[PDB]
Structures are given as C-alpha cells and as structure tokens.
C-alpha cells in the first residue's frame, strides 16, 4: 500500500519551495541560478505530488472522475518538457547559459574569439541599441549587462526558439555626438531580405 502521509510531506515541501521561489530577487547572476534551481525543484515536487495522488486514487479505485484532469496535467508537463529542451537548444545556439538564466523571449548574440555575447531582449525591433560603458566596462541593452571582453561586431543576431533576425551596425555615437561622457552607443538596423 501507498501511505497517505507522503502526499502531505510532498505538499509541505512543494509549498516551501514554491513560496521561496516567489520571493527571490532576480538581480545578480547567482540569484538567477538559484531561482532556476528552485523552480526546477518545484516542478519535480509538483510531478511527485501529482503522480502520487493519482496513484492514491488508483489504489482507492476513485481515479475515473479525475482521468481528464490528470491527463491534462501530464499533457501540459510534456509541453513543459519540450519547452525545457528548446531552452537547452537555445543555450547551445547562443553558446551561452543565459537562456537558462533569463526568461526573455529573445537573445541578442554575437561571437568574438574570446567570448560569446548573449543579452536578453523582449521583441524583434527594427533597430537595436547596444550601450557600452568603459571603466565596470560593459555592454548593456534594456538594463541587461554583459562584461566587456572584446569589441562589437558589424553584425549581431537576435535568436528565439524558431527565428533569427540579423542586425547590421549603422552608426556609432560617441560622447562628442551625444554629450554623455564615457559612454558609446552602437546602433544596429535590422537587415531585411
């Protein structure tokens, strides 16, 4: 027999981890990794309590008025598994772990010999501005920051699960152009074909 108390223990642990996941600030990279790990543990606990309660129902014999609900859970969890696979493939394509750390719809990426840049971005726009601050020395879009390791490229690429859009560097705004000291603005126009 399957005792009922493991369902309560699983519910209590799931509540602990879900409540903790609700209140982790997403500012530093270690906090992002912590939040992703806690969400992974939450999903594992949710799978446990779902499967275990379904087993309790089956051992009781009252599963039949819940087949549609449990099938719905398993279908949505299969979709989530496919989504996690696509996120890992986005990490492979971006040559970065940032798609795992960030929930953004898009990632602006470019390749240098010593670093692969991958910055979160929300939508496909006709232009993209990369802000570069010197000495930390960093690239920044939308308040998202990557440490400077090398120069800009003439072409950057916005990646999603299914799309890739290329951007060509059109203009470089210096402090004499803008008045903002110690800051450069690289302006990219979307390539249309």
């Amino acid at each position: 027999s399957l005792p009922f108390g493991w369902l309560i223990v699983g519910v209590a642990l799931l509540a602990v981890f879900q409540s903790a996941s609700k209140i982790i600030t997403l500012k530093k990279r270690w906090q992002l990794a912590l939040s992703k790990g806690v969400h992974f543990v939450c999903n594992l606990l949710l799978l446990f309590v779902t499967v275990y309660s379904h087993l309790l129902l089956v051992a009781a014999g009252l599963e039949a008025p819940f087949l549609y609900l449990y099938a719905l859970v398993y279908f949505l969890q299969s979709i989530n598994f496919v989504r996690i696979i696509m996120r890992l493939w986005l990490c492979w394509k971006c040559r970065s772990k940032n798609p795992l750390l960030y929930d953004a719809n898009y990632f602006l990426c470019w390749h240098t010999n010593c670093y692969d840049y991958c910055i979160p971005y929300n939508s496909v726009t006709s232009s993209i501005v990369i802000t570069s601050g010197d000495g930390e020395h960093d690239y920044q879009i939308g308040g998202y920051t990557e440490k400077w390791e090398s120069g800009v490229k003439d072409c950057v690429v916005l990646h999603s699960y299914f799309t890739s859009d290329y951007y060509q560097l059109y203009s470089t705004q210096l402090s004499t152009d803008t008045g903002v000291e110690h800051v450069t603005f690289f302006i990219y126009n979307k390539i249309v074909d």
Partner: protein, 31 residues
C-alpha cells in the same frame, strides 16, 4: 531536431493567435 523545430513554430503561433481570436469578446468584457 531540425524538422521538429520548424514544425513547432507555426503550431505555437497559430494556437496563440486562435486563443486571441476566440477570447476577444471576453477580454473586452473584463476591460
């Protein structure tokens, strides 16, 4: 993997477009 990736895109997009279509009046009703 390449085939299934191209399969998944329009399916997801059309699902969300359809869910926008069938729920337009209700979402107006909240607003």
């Amino acid at each position: 993997f390449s085939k299934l990736r191209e399969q998944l895109g329009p399916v997801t997009q059309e699902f969300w477009d359809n869910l926008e279509k069938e729920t337009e009046g209700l979402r107006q009703e909240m607003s």
